[PDB]
């Protein structure tokens, strides 16, 4: 399938963000797009019975914040684990792309 247009917005909480495909485009669909019981998904993260649990402190698979700003990850990049990977060690890198306020994810 094809990528949609810019300008994208992430609005499930009071700090949405705005998601570019054309930022991102030279990693494979399925490495945001997880496929799920074998086929391809394409839902939006925090689908019912998806990535819906919306209190920061919850660990689990289900929780929205973790699959975004999990510093660490495994099986699936988080947001924050690929950004913080392409800042690295990098001043400006980390303020546009890992930081928490006047970030390019939170500006
Ligand atoms: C881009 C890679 C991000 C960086 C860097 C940080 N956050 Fe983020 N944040 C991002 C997304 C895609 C979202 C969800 C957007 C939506 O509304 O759908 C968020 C949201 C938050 C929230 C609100 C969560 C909630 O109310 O359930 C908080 C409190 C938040 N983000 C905090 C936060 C902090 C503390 C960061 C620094 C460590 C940080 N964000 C960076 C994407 C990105
Ligand atoms: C990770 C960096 C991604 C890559 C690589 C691709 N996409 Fe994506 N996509 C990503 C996010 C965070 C979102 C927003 C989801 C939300 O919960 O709001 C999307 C969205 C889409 C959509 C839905 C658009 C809509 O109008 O709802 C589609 C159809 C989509 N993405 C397709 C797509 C394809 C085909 C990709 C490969 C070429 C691709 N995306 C890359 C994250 C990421
Ligand atoms: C519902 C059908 C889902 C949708 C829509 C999205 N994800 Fe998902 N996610 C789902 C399951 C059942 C799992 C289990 C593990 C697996 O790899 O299948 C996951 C996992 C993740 C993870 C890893 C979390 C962890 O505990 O380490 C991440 C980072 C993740 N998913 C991200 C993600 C994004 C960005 C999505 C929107 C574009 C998205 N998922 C959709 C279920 C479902
Ligand atoms: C690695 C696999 C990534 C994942 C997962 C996500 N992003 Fe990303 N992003 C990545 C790179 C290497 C870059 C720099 C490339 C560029 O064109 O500048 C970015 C850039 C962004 C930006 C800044 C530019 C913009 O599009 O506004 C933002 C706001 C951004 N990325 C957001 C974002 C979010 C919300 C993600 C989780 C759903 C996410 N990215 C995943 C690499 C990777
Ligand atoms: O944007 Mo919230 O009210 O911390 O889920």
Avoid: W
Wanted: charged share 30%.
């Amino acid at each position: 399938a094809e990528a949609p247009a810019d300008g994208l917005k992430m609005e499930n909480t009071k700090m949405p963000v705005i998601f570019n495909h054309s930022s991102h485009s030279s990693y494979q669909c399925a490495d945001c797009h997880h496929p799920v019981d074998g086929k391809e998904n394409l839902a939006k993260c925090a689908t019912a019975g998806c990535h819906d649990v919306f209190d920061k402190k919850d660990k689990s698979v289900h929780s929205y914040y973790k699959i975004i700003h999990d510093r660490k990850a495994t099986t699936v990049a988080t947001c924050m684990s690929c950004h913080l990977e392409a800042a690295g060690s990098d001043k400006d890198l980390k303020k546009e792309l890992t930081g928490c306020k006047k970030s390019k994810c939170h500006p």
